[PDB]
Amino acid sequence: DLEKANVRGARAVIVDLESDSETIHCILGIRKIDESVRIIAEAERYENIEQLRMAGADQVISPFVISGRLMSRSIDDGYEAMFVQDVLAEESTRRMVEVPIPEGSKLEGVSVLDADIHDVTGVIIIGVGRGDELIIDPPRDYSFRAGDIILGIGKPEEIERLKNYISA
Amino acid sequence: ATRILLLVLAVIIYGTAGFHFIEGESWTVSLYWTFVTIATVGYGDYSPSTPLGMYFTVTLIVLGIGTFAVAVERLLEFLINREQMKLMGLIDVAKSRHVVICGWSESTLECLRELRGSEVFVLAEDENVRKKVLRSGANFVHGDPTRVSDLEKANVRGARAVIVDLESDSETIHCILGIRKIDESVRIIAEAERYENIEQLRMAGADQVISPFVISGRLMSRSIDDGYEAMFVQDVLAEESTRRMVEVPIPEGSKLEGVSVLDADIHDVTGVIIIGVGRGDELIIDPPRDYSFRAGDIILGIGKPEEIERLKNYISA
Amino acid sequence: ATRILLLVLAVIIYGTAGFHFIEGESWTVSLYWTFVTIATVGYGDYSPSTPLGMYFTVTLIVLGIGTFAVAVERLLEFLINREQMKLMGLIDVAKSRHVVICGWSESTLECLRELRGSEVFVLAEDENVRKKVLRSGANFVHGDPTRVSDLEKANVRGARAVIVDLESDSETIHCILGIRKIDESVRIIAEAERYENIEQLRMAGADQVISPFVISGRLMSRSIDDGYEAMFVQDVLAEESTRRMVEVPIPEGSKLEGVSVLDADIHDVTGVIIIGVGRGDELIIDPPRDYSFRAGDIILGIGKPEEIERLKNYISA
Amino acid sequence: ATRILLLVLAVIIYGTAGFHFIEGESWTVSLYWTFVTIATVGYGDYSPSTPLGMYFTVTLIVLGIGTFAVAVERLLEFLINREQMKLMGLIDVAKSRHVVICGWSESTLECLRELRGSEVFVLAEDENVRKKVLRSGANFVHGDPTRVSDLEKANVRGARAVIVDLESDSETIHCILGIRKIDESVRIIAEAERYENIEQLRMAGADQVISPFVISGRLMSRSIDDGYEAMFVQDVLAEESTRRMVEVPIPEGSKLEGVSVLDADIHDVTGVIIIGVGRGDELIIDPPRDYSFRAGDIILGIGKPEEIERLKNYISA
Amino acid sequence: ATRILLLVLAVIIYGTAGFHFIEGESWTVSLYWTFVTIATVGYGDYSPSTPLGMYFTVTLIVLGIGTFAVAVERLLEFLINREQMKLMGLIDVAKSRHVVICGWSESTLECLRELRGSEVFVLAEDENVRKKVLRSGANFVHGDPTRVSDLEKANVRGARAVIVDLESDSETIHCILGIRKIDESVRIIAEAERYENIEQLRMAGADQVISPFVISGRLMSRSIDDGYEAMFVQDVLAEESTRRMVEVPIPEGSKLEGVSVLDADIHDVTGVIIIGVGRGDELIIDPPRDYSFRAGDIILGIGKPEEIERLKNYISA
Numbered sequence A: 001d002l003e004k005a006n007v008r009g010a011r012a013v014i015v016d017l018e019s020d021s022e023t024i025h026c027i028l029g030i031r032k033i034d035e036s037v038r039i040i041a042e043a044e045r046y047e048n049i050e051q052l053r054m055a056g057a058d059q060v061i062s063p064f065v066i067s068g069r070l071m072s073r074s075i076d077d078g079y080e081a082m083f084v085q086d087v088l089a090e091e092s093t094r095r096m097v098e099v100p101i102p103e104g105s106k107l108e109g110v111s112v113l114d115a116d117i118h119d120v121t122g123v124i125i126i127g128v129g130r131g132d133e134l135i136i137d138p139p140r141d142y143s144f145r146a147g148d149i150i151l152g153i154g155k156p157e158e159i160e161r162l163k164n165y166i167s168a
Numbered sequence B, C, D, E: 001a002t003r004i005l006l007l008v009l010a011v012i013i014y015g016t017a018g019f020h021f022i023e024g025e026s027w028t029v030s031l032y033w034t035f036v037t038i039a040t041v042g043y044g045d046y047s048p049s050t051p052l053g054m055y056f057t058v059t060l061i062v063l064g065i066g067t068f069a070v071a072v073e074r075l076l077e078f079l080i081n082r083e084q085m086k087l088m089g090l091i092d093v094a095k096s097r098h099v100v101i102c103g104w105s106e107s108t109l110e111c112l113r114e115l116r117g118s119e120v121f122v123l124a125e126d127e128n129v130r131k132k133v134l135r136s137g138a139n140f141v142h143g144d145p146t147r148v149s150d151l152e153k154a155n156v157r158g159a160r161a162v163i164v165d166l167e168s169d170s171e172t173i174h175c176i177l178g179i180r181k182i183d184e185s186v187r188i189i190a191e192a193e194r195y196e197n198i199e200q201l202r203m204a205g206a207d208q209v210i211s212p213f214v215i216s217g218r219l220m221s222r223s224i225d226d227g228y229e230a231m232f233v234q235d236v237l238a239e240e241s242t243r244r245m246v247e248v249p250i251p252e253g254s255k256l257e258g259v260s261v262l263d264a265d266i267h268d269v270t271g272v273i274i275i276g277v278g279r280g281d282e283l284i285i286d287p288p289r290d291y292s293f294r295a296g297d298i299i300l301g302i303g304k305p306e307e308i309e310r311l312k313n314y315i316s317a
């Protein structure tokens, strides 16, 4: 029945079902059809997160584990959920962005020390990803190459300064 | 209820007025012998030696056994009724620092693994929820959480915080509007399903609105092509595999009071990416170059759990 | 059943017939010793001395422990069976001035806030309805209210008034016909749902028909343009915010017996707009200028709570 | 089970040994003192004089209160488990002349009105059926009546007659086929819903098939024009207002043995219409004139309840 | 649960420190007296003399009745809570060679006719399952078998073999992945429904898949024309009417260690058709001429029970 919905040769296959028991079986049914298509699952419980990666999901999102861990911590202070709601969920003023580095434009081969990425733009640099590997908080001894996806948190007036700082 | 004590006092005054008027002892030793005979002790130091006392002590003993029978019948009936009412959660709540959880879902089950079992109170209405609650170790209170007179049975006026996560997004607004009539200042944490209802929960009075379905609906659509944003949210907020989003409070003194973030230099000497500071119910994300720290500030930053131990010692003095 | 009493009389007569014939003591002292030993008081003044008497006292102690065990066993079995048969509502009703409420809705949950808790008996069948009854302090009688055999279980023959409010109108006409077969004079207050069933509840035998869905059909379709009639019905009949509709009886004599409404002129004296007068199970709304009050008339009027206490003192004797 | 008795015999042998080996009195007075002490009678004529014996007495008192607590715990556990098992079915029928009723409907509620209370064991599966049976006075056995293993719980092997009225005809056939596997001699009375399954219940092993949906299927389709056939069936078989279809056997002797129906002349001397005689598991409707009566033949006749008392005197001697 | 022993020690030290400091006896004698008094024994060799000691004895008596009352109250609370949290599951398994059956169907009801009653623990969630489990002798552990937190409540880490037959097929794969997270060496016997999930149950970690719906699909499509395949499967594997499939090992010695299949000649000396041999976690179906028998090999053969008993005799030395 997954072949009727043309899961073979798609952009990505978003999988979210009524329970985690059907989410694992849907991923295992897609990997019997296409072994290269991108599966974006939705884990319900915390213990079923590593069962979706073994089943073959290329990205596992867990809403009730983030919202579970943000309910128990928002009892006394509640400043950690005020970041996730105002950046990841609503994008009130700041928003999480990911931008690529094209070929040979202002950052090819430079280190992160004299890149000065936080001052001239204003966007907080969380991590730099190279080939499905996110290096959160890259160290000072780290160079930038083409194709590296820079993951940042900033206002929309600052990301357009960042994309101008990345371009040639 | 109260007539049991009346029957106890009636049998006691009957025993004393019989023993004094038959055996001929003073009232102190007659009351002492009455309490010895009623409680079935029988020291025998003041046993009746008269035949009339020997036939009256039979009546006092059978009245004492009837008193014990009626008292234990009322005790066992009250115990069985209170344990049947505590079984299906038809009890009131008399705690004072508890966490009422209106409704039950997987997002409320994950907030029991970071709290205490007997501390929290689940206020739901379904039947299979009550069995699901006790396996996690919480206290089930049967009631309609959208009803105001059934939040008062959960003691929501004297609650530490209230976590609202109901079956639909139309009942989360009704549960919050019911609590904010009972207690204005209690802390309500809510779960918004739709994106359009986030401004309704802040207007109804939720002090912190979480929207787990808006977060996934943006992480699913931006991770179709490459998706490095959904790897950060999963590895930091969800799994805490390498990093953890930690919040540290600044105490008085603290060797960093009044300093700006230029001279603080928290990321370069410790390794924690300072996201924002918690200056008084507003999260100043990316504070400026001349922001001055204050007392009771909550620094919100991400980093390795080794890098928090180099921050929790750098922040205390 | 009562075989506990036969076993207790058997062990008493065994103790007396053993002790009097073994230890050589008279019958009254042996009876006193048996009632001391079985109930475990043990005064020790007439304890045995022969080894046969000692072995007989051991067997009497064994039989007393046994009769205490079977007595507490029968008591615990009866208490458990009763308090589980009282929990789900499989018991009969013994009250004789109570109110039976057939079915359960919000229209009968707003009725229990102006009545007592133990005075009312909800006759329903659904299991989740039963838990809704016990929160409001009422008593739950399990049964189908349409069945005549299960209306006698709620003691509807000697009830004060019966409130019929079922899940449809077809069950409401059948519940009224089931009560009028039992008692032809008990007061039935029924809730009609459709407009076509108002005349059918009165042929079924309902003494009072209250149709809330027809009121809100005439208050929704007439509040679209202006909406001034629905402000009166909400403020006087629903909320009772400023004005309130009251029923004040005329007692014996009471300073207004025989004068007309011209000689009374209640609106200038008190301020209560007299809607109608209840002379003997009828309502003369807007009584004429030559109408005269009688003893036992029910004045129906609206007014403020400070304005109605002036009417009850103007009507007192 | 018997570990309670092991504990009580251990503590009595402990008391006897620790009184004899310490106080040095005889063995029978040590056993007497142990049974006086552990039952909390306390005669005091053999109180411990040695302080080592006094510590032994405190230890024996602690062990006796402990073994009474373990006995009370075991008794409450047994009574709660057996009372909660009994309330929701789950007990095999230990009767020998009972009537099993598989399933429950209104046709098995108008059957209980001519049967006893403890004689009927309803074998059903649903939970709302359980409350309907216990109000009706019968007993409920929880089980699947289509399963052979659950028909043996109701003691269908030694039942008197088994009445089958399940949800549909598909399970009524499977219930008769399950009883006939168990015994081929018990009387099965089954309700057929459809007309085409009347021949299927009789091949399954039903002794009597009653099809009320086919009776009213033809009584509705013949009462559209005139409706006199359904005026007889409702006045004789259903309500029995004026007449009653009665069956009377012919006892031994009885002044009518061997005579033909014309010389017996039952209708014109009594007033009953003789429909047919019950000659050996076969009803001969409208018997011929040369039919001679036999002993044990059941005569089926309609008539007034005064014409049956005139019949049961004319049929007897 | 610890307040009761605290109050018991409090009233014990109150009894000692009142008897010693009012009457004036020694410490051990006052301990003996207060343990005699609180246990309602009452020897009466150390009765109080002064009336102040008499009133102290009355206070000790009423406080001892109070501590017995609160101790029986807490014991009844714990016992009713335990007996209602054991009747409907909600309990942990303490055995460590048991069999856990996740889910409940007719394919696991037949699995209880070849196992013991109280050995197996059926882990399910529905209430209709629970009354079906207890009628068949098994123990019911209420819990979601797809959840890893409720598989540890069934003690699946120390279980002997696990049987997964859940009401869907997506949950059979999920329950195996929950068990293999817990114990990577326990034996999982799963039921596959669809054909494409037999390979998905083995990659999940099931040691033995059983697909009964693939079997019936391959027999319902090959029995239309002649159907001799389904006569062998029903007579050997389902009913064992005349033939029977067995699995016999090769014990130590066994007289055939090393010979070929031609030299053993098992088909001619016993009549048992050799299908395959069990050499080390694989099945060599139809072993060739040059195959050599070893020790511990499981011989799988079909035959009559009068032929298998001569096969177990031939494999002994």
Ligand SMILES: [C][C][C][C]N([C][C][C][C])([C][C][C][C])[C]C1=[C][C]=C([C]([O])C2=[C][C]=[C][C]=[C]2)[C]=[C]1
Pocket: B008, B038, B039, B040, B064, B065, B067, B068, B071, B072, C038, C039, C040, C065, C068, D039, D040, E039, E040, E065
């Ligand atoms: C046999 C065994 C023993 C038991 N007993 C005795 C009885 C006899 C039958 C003792 C205790 C110990 C455990 C019981 C009892 C107790 C107590 C008493 C007392 O009075 C009382 C109670 C309640 C109210 C009032 C009073 C009474 C009574």
Ligand SMILES: [K+]
Pocket: B040, B041, B042, C040, C041, C042, D040, D041, D042, E040, E041, E042
């Ligand atoms: K005593």
Ligand SMILES: [K+]
Pocket: C072, D072, E072
């Ligand atoms: K007790």
Ligand SMILES: [K+]
Pocket: B039, B040, B041, C039, C040, C041, D039, D040, D041, E039, E040, E041
């Ligand atoms: K006693």
